[model samples]
Target: SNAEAMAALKLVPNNADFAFQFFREVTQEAPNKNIFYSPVSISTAFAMLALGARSATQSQILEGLAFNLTEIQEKEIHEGFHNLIHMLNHPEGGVQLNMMNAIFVTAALALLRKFLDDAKALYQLEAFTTDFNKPTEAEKQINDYIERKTHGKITNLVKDMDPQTVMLLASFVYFKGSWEKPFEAEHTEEREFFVDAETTVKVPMMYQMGRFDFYFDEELSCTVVRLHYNGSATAFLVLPAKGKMKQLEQTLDKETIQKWSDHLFQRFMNLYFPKFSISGSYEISNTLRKMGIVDVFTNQADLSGITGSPDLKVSKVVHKASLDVDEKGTTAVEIMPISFPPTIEFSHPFLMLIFDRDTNSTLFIGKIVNPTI
Candidate 1:
């Protein structure tokens, strides 16, 4: 079955491409603040919705998700997600990844048996019955579920509830990974990080020396490096020179990202980066609408595949994610060439992407404008 499962991996890249587009859209919406989200999580939630959508409604979702309806059939799409989830959950080595999905339907609502079966079989999610009449209780129940799933890093995912809310889709991811070459805590010293030309803050800057996969893009004026973690995952840090982050982000895309990966080579570096942790959430309904997914939120939606009646539509699309990067568990030196180690210091705003090296699936992505925040 590995052969068949691996074949299903084709769908992930298309979804990831869509994810990057969505990431850019969200960035445009809030250009000044730090941003982070799980593209896999967002696409997974939408895939579940597509299962219960019909005709143009379904086609809109698939198209908006960057899937080619002419090439990959709908059934193949679901199977691809099924395989992707299995691989990510059972990762190699000691990486801890907790990704979960759930559907909360108002109590006493009747759902299609076939829809329920496919959701369970394909996405491994179960629909729970909750009494939305007690709005406060319902809100607490959903928030508590998210907090537990994301290891308490995310709380109050769903703020105020709409009692008329028929169904809500929720997903969360929590990832914990240790560096392949652990950064020594003792070497972490206080240093100033320039938040902007006028603002500076002290941070516990971490130090490391090793041969890493790195690249310096002269056009973008940024140094990109890949740091490996156990379980075949890696952290890609992009530190822009002086004032180039705006340009780097403006030109960011799938092709540009691939070029950076292709050019990265093993090299020794005296790296300095802040010891930081960050988390972010998004109420992405408006953003999705801006991206041409408007019908799903209105009464015009045709989600009749779920209840055999056209009564249900999306009330909210909420996503929450968290990432922890630290020292954990690698080596080599000496060759025919002699050179000085270049210093790669992230003493300013930068971008980070945490992903699975084997599948090339992004687990988390963010921009760190202020690490202390």
Candidate 2:
């Protein structure tokens, strides 16, 4: 499986490219609101959906995810996803990251035997059955399953399902990681955060002063700092200068971020990061449609692979992400370091993302606007 994931690493670039495109769409929907999601999770779910799609329906899903179908065959793509999902389960440390791909379909329809088998083997997608005619109970069962799967961090993810809906597909990521060097609780204090030039709010700011991998993007006018987790995984926080956030986002790409990661140098600094909890729930069906995935949702959809009948169409794609950050990250066994260094306080909105060093894949990506929200 390790070797298989390494083979799947060939798709890492495609995944990253898709992550950027998807992130941009989510941000465009409402720039002022907090943003967070799992690109790997979203794509994994759709990749499984591709298993049941046929003709143009299938190609749109893969292409919408930034895959060049002309260059990579569909079979290879699914195998790559299988390897990718399996590889992520390989342990690092301290970080708890799990991605789930599921589909709740009406029991009245019989799924193709091969489709169910392929979904399980390739995407690990769990299929749930229920009667969509009873929309109320359908909603309740779906919400409870989501809440239970997310350990209650997420609740009531879906509501008011259309009785005509034959299936509801879902994707989510659960991640928990503690900082390598825990911050002292005593140093935390309430501080004013300038969410924007006009809106300001008080938030508990966590302080830590020590050597860290840091870089300043001159062109973007942003500060990039890498905070290590207990394992090989780490977080990259980007704080753009006031009035530069929009510029940074417009110029954000895989190459620019790779350059930032490559140029990072160690430096001692006092990090003033807010201890905040934030989450985002979005219905991204339109976003996907905008990316040229239009057929699956329309009457022209062909999901014959699922039931051998071209009567199914995707009704919605709901994504939710939640996380809490505080001084209490993980266990503390860090050594002391002498320091009197420049300070960097994230008192303004900032961008953040976490990735695995081994696989070079994004675990989660998000931005903080009003922390309390």
Candidate 3:
């Protein structure tokens, strides 16, 4: 049922158009020879996918949100949500978000509108931060909400949820699973890596010296390695040729992204990526505008569906993202707390999501972990 929602949402022209632009922007900025996107990440990309379908009007969308929050919550959920989206698209790459966090938030918001009607629904919202200087009470509230909703499976997102976190989010979902062969600290170690050519970075890299569903693409100039989490799914990492980051981003695009469906070749080789601590924080409005999404996040942007009328508008959007890879599985923390399930891993090459905001649907889910060299 949810998959069907994801499929139908992709057909919307606005949704598709925006998603393509997002892909272009990301590929241009950080494209690598080895790239693996989580299958469920689309749920977190709300800004690109919120275009109300032909059947779902503006008012209906807002009405749908009314029942999603608590009675004490105010009626500014749209603004709060819109702001969070901005943070996600921020130039500094707001927070390190993984596929699961993206999926959880996407589905929760969409379903919130789906189950609630306008009358009893309340759009209770409060601003957590004004200048991106400190986390507001609202930020803490959202983190607590997600922790309770997910039953601690997603505690990472809200654990150190920066109060000055220019953006924050919350979501609820259904998930249950564990690693078939759980890993411990003994399985990991400190390894030397190339953050880029001519530069070696020592990091705590998780090592799993085993035969995985792997690939060696000479054309892509990289290797694909999968670390299976039990039997459900695996996290794949793409390690590119030294000093090839710029060349990779310049050429990778949507068309090439579709080339890797079952992206594994079962090769025997060594795999190592810097266990580096990477974080990005920025005002994503400029990038969104560059992608032709100018109206929604600004104060003049129209979000009548979220307000029952055209009186509502967006002020800003901020995003915070962080990513850390270990031997057990990669743990990415993002402001969009409801991104996905812990069990959902990126083992084989699979389509990753870029979701919609209004209905929690996938706007673009493409397969491309390797760009042909």
Candidate 4:
């Protein structure tokens, strides 16, 4: 059983890059960064499990994926990612901290563990742990797990995660580390940040005023900001060209994503990001339903991909997440907040993710974000 399950999982690497780029392009077009890693991992897990389950047909599996991922499943929600992406991708702005995005991501990850275990009813690998609860206690365990797995260089995001949320997770891995170029503690300050144009609040922000590489698109009148990590990998900020958010998304796709990676040039500038705390809450039932993921959430839907039992329906899918990115690095926390009424759906314009740089073999993807604590 383990062999079969592992065999199915092997194919995931072959398509990881493709799926990573695909998920990123689609989510970027709409503009949410929720559960960016969870979905990709879950999909890969599901593909493996469903292949051997025998009860699940390729079309059925594909339908499940399409129903679960894309927004055409829900008209309003479909418009949400596109809308959010348009705004974030806009040549003018990016979010201080994507809140709704973080919640959705945590939920998807928890769900992945549950569904994958269900699929492997007969296998007993015990390699992954669904332990996100016990934030205080689990933090050490998960942090250590990731550090060892990634060889200790990746220490970012996921720190002091809420204990309750940390316990319910199936595949829980947390990391935190310092930036190669640590920011001087003296440069940080309390500054006013605009939550909305009219709403501003004072919060701590990490500031880096330097000459790094940057590029300007004269045609789109947009700008790209780059944040380098310790390794060759980097993060990007693509501000829309003037007021045209939708146009930029229309022009962005896999090719654009790849091209951005290829064309990114470093530059120096005065950069500031929120050192402020963020907390977000999300009811993803609507988002998931809108994304055509009704089956697993409904009694009529089947999780036969995991097992032949039509009896084993997805009772619930819940998520919770916390992350802070500063000069030191990132500390991430996640939890599964709800799984009740035996139903849940993803709604709203949350975050969709593409974590291609994490592992050479594992390309993480998903939707949903945690804006609330």
Candidate 5:
């Protein structure tokens, strides 16, 4: 009941902390390219899979997710997820946030009754049976479902399905929201965005002069700004000066993030952030493996809780996300504004994140090296 859900919420901060570590590994893999992902989405997907894991397999999955096994009970873990999803999915004033999960099993394979019941009841994931012998049809159906769920923003999530695949677990999230303080369209103009030391591109930069929660870290050498949306959802924008992205990336930690959250002070500022939109697709199995989540993808796996037999293994794990930012927010009832504000411009490579403070859930995180690309 609510006991499990309450316990579940308590475990999320640990998960969010681990998510940043996961993203750090992701950035290392791609080096200087753009990065985007939903830590909550990836963790939720694996947590659903973890429900079927047993013994060492279960322990490894939890460890890979950076959870201290001694701190929380397994039942509490699932209940926490149940509560987390329920809280995130509830309507948030006018913000757009959607998260969904699915379990696709091979036809004629009987699932454990308890597994089926708990997944649906706790995670809200629906189970479907598909003939894996027809891999083409199964792949199409999975991709189509994701495309529809994300309003066509995400497609082709499952590129290839194994003919011998017995089960597949999936998750997807989509978000769009207006700035609490909207920028004026008349102030938007073509501005130069520094892509690198030698390259620059012109972009439509939106300008606004308003009071905002802001902070500048001397140690990290980055400017941190919090943009508020309706319903307590906030986006944290981090811009590393000049060629400091690498150093800042290495120094970033939960403590550093918490410090930024604590240091933010409302001040009138001039801001020029580019109007940008981006999407990312990734196969994170190798990334997770590097982070110590190994057994699930190997034959030694024990997902016996699903069918009461150790016959299943994760064939692949994939994720995709898309986001857009512009001057959409509360329009002033009357236009009366002016100030000699400190100017800050996001005209270069930077990192951004979208999160809900109420639930302490990180919905999206990405690095924009070149929005033009």
Candidate 6:
């Protein structure tokens, strides 16, 4: 099993890029605010949707996710996720995490047998039947499932269902990393966060002093600090020392990130991080359209593989995420040198991410504009 999983792991490179690209686009739409979303959660749902799509429709979805079907075949793409999802959801005893995928179909439409089988086999997703004859009940049924699965990250995934709905696909992921070095509660204090030059707000800032993987990029004018979790995962925070976030983002990509990681020096420093909670709910149906996944939603779409008819079209794809950055992680679960140790305080808005070093996948990526409500 590990052998096949290792073989299929080639997709992470693109998956990693997809994580950042999706974050940038969604942040663009909702500018100057706290941001959070699961790239793998969205990809898993879309990858499952491709099971019902054909011709250009399927290729568009995969390519939009930064996958080159020519290099990595369609079957391989799904096969990769089969193992990726399996490994991601497995209990590692370090990070408290769970990812879910399911489709709720209106009892009125009978889905294709082959598509259903492939969805379960490759994407590890199952279809649940619901009576859309009563839209409110259907909404409650679907949203309730998500709420139960993701630690209440999302309660109303489907707010008001369309009476004519055929099927609703959903995906969600949850994580709380118990740090390798948990921030001492006694060290936390009420500190001011610079939401902007003119505005400031008080936040509970988590503090710890230890040697962490640190990198200072002069060109980007940002400091990259890597904090380890109790497991194979690590959280990275990017603080812009000078210039704007947009300026550094223009040149930031997967390779550049790797470069920073590869060159990180173990530096002893005082660390100050904010304790905050945020949930990001975004509808990226049109955003996918901008990225070439056009036909899946419009009247021109062909979803015959799903129901053996050309009458189906996707109405929307909504991704909702919940994240908490408290002093406590899910479990009680690393090292290196320096001079006049200057402390680094996340006193302003910065970038944050929870990434699995073992899986080489970004679990969550977001920004903190204001730490407190």
Which is the better candidate, 3 or 5, if ranked by lDDT?
A: 5
Looking at model 1, residue 360 earns an lDDT score of: 64
lDDT of 1 at 280: 83
Tens digit per residue, CA lDDT, model 1, 41-151: 777778888999987778888878788899888888888787767667764533446677788887756789989898888887868888988999999988888877666
- Ordered by lDDT, highest first, the candidates read 2, 5, 1, 6, 4, 3
Compute the lDDT for candidate 5.
Answer: 0.81
Error of 5 at 338 (Å): 9.6
lDDT of each: 0.79, 0.82, 0.35, 0.38, 0.81, 0.78
**Most lDDT-accurate candidate:** 2
After superposition on all CA atoms, what RMSD does each candidate show versus the true structure? 2.3, 2.6, 13.4, 15.6, 3.0, 3.0
- Candidate 1 lDDT: 0.79
By summed lDDT, the worst window of 10 consecutive residues in model 6 runs over 329-338
Give the worst 10-residue stretch by lDDT in candidate 4. 96-105
Error of 6 at 108 (Å): 3.0
Clashing residue pair totals per candidate (backbone < 3 A):
0, 0, 58, 93, 1, 0
Q: Candidate 5: which pairs clash?
A: 8-80
What TM-score should be assigned to candidate 4?
0.50
What is candidate 2's CA lDDT for residue 315?
74
Across 234-292, the per-residue lDDT of candidate 6 in tens digits comes to 88899986347877665667887888888998788999999888777776787788767
Indicate the worst ten consecutive residues by lDDT in candidate 1: 329-338
Which model is ahead, 1 or 3, in terms of lDDT?
A: 1
Q: Where is model 1 more than 4 Å wrong at Cα?
A: 1-5, 91-96, 330-339
Of the pair 4 and 5, which is ahead by lDDT? Answer: 5
